[PDB]
Structure 1
Amino acid sequence: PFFDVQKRLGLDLDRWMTIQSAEQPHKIPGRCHAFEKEWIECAHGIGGIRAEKECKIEFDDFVECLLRQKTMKRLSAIKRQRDKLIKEGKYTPPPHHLGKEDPR
């Protein structure tokens, strides 16, 4: 019985702690504030059920925001690719002594 007395009385005593955004001290951003914000703005009158259909893309991008799962599978695929080229390729000289220290 999800009594929601805190809502009817408006106490909000619990609600603040919820969600990545929702006002945080010194306005420190969440790491994934944006995808979350979009995804919640997508979510209202649609309510729960249809929401798992239509807002799926937003939640997806939010997922990758959280875990960085796919970008890791990619980046792993590249770094593992590079070993094959390690004898066939010498990569990049600057990493070692380029303008990156001049860069700032």
Structure 2
Amino acid sequence: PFFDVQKRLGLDLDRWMTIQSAEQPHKIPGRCHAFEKEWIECAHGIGGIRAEKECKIEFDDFVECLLRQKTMKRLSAIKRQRDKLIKEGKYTPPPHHLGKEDPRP
């Protein structure tokens, strides 16, 4: 099946592209560098089953960074409630959200 020639010879044929946080050119960081680093360090040398059971918090944070489903849900809820209130007329946006603010450098 998997004949690990690379680890036997220390060649690094294709291991540099496997993860986001592995020696990017000009040290350009990935969007989720910190979360991936945390999860990788949590799950190293632990085994698949134990990594799945024990490092679930880090993987959940990593997936949240990748897809941001919960952030989208929260923003959508806030926007919908604001729209409902502005339809009923009990809420008025501040000048900052109307373009009348004073911008800063």
Q: TM-score, normalised by structure 2?
A: 0.86
**Runs of 4+ more than 3 Å apart:** 87-103
Cα 1:97–1:69 shift into 2, 3 Å: closer
Pair 81,93 (structure 1): closer, same or farther in 2 beyond 3 Å:
closer
Greater mean deviation of Cα atoms: 92-101 or 6-15: 92-101
Shift of 1:45: 1.9
TM-score by length of 1: 0.86
1:99 alignment counterpart? 99
1:87 equivalent in structure 2 = 87
The more displaced of 24-33 and 88-97 is 88-97
Query: Shift in Å at residue 61 of structure 1?
Result: 0.4
Shift of 1:75: 0.6
Residue 25 (str. 1) matches residue 42 (str. 2): no
Shift of the alpha carbon at 1:47?
A: 1.2
Task: Give unmatched runs, 5+ long, in structure 2.
Answer: none
Distance 1:40 1:91, change over 3 A: same
Aligned residues: percent identity?
100
1:83 Cα offset (Å): 1.6
Question: Contact 2:86/2:92 (CA < 8 Å) preserved in 1?
Answer: no
- Consecutive unaligned residues of structure 1, counting only runs of 5 or more, are none
Deviations 1:61-94 (A, max 9, x none): 0000000000101110111111210144465555
Q: Root-mean-square deviation (CA), in Å? A: 2.2
In structure 2, relative to structure 1, the CA distance for the partners of 1:69 and 1:97 (3 Å cut) is closer
- The alignment of Structure 1 onto Structure 2 pairs a total of residues equal to 104
